[PDB]
Amino acid sequence: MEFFGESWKKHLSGEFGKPYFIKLMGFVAEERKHYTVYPPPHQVFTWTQMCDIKDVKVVILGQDPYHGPNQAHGLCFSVQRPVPPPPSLENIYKELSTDIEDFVHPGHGDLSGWAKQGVLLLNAVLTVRAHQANSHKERGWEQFTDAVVSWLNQNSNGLVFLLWGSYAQKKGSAIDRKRHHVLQTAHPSPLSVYRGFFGCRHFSKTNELLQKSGKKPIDWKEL
DNA sequence: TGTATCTT
DNA sequence: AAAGATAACA
Numbered sequence: 001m002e003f004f005g006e007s008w009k010k011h012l013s014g015e016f017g018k019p020y021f022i023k024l025m026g027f028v029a030e031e032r033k034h035y036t037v038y039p040p041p042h043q044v045f046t047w048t049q050m051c052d053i054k055d056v057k058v059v060i061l062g063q064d065p066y067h068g069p070n071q072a073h074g075l076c077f078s079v080q081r082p083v084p085p086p087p088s089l090e091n092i093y094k095e096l097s098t099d100i101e102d103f104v105h106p107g108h109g110d111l112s113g114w115a116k117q118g119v120l121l122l123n124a125v126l127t128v129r130a131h132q133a134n135s136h137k138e139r140g141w142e143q144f145t146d147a148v149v150s151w152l153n154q155n156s157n158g159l160v161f162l163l164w165g166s167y168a169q170k171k172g173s174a175i176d177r178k179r180h181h182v183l184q185t186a187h188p189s190p191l192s193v194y195r196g197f198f199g200c201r202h203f204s205k206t207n208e209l210l211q212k213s214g215k216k217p218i219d220w221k222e223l
Numbered sequence: 224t225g226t227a228t229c230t231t
Numbered sequence: 232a233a234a235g236a237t238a239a240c241a
């Protein structure tokens with residue numbers, strides 16, 4: 001119980017009774033019986049437990065969870081102490097250090113600090129079979145995360161979406177590019193970071209857009 | 224050994 | 232689809 005934060009469950013509950021969702025949860029359940037799936041069930045929706053849905057100001061959309069033991073916990077790119085930051089996160093910190101002058105490696109990989117500030121740390125696909133990246137794509141997660149993006153698009157204003165990677169970028173078409181700001185770059189994984197993530201300056205750019213629309217910027221060092 | 228994106 | 236090529240790093 002209580003895997004979903006109250007305000008999130010209230011606005012996404014309409015998906016629960018849909019065939020694709022019932023079949024999606026059915027698939028993940030069958031998978032957990034034969035393989036190790038990440039993150040654990042009680043953490044698949046951690047991204048709804050950090051702030052009220054109406055308080056989201058920035059959305060970071062990744063591809064799918066870390067596929068190693070004890071890494072993924074429901075917030076994209078984040079890992080709970082004492083787990084060391086995986087390759088993707090070390091790259092995010094590397095960019096943050098050159099993008100934000102006051103930013104220095106926090107010495108851990110827990111990104112709850114950002115989420116509590118209204119930064120939704122979402123992935124297009126919310127589960128993954130151990131050691132197999134994007135193994136759970138096209139099973140129904142995409143329509144669910146589409147519902148999340150769609151609600152935010154219609155009920156919020158001036159949000160800043162950071163779509164990292166081709167899969168996250170599939171959601172760009174559902175975002176009113178006039179009402180919200182969409183920043184797109186390569187995924188921070190070592191296998192693609194060199195295609196543009198380094199130098200993208202999305203963190204400083206995100207705050208410029210927020211402050212321009214009179215909103216409090218994100219303190220990226222607040223972790 | 225191990226962490227995307229484009230092409231056939 | 233899904234496998235192969237291409238691709239930084241350590």
Ligand SMILES: O=c1cc[nH]c(=O)[nH]1
Pocket residue numbers: 062063064065066072075076077078088123
């Ligand atoms: O949560 C995560 C971690 C790495 N890469 C992603 O796309 N998401």
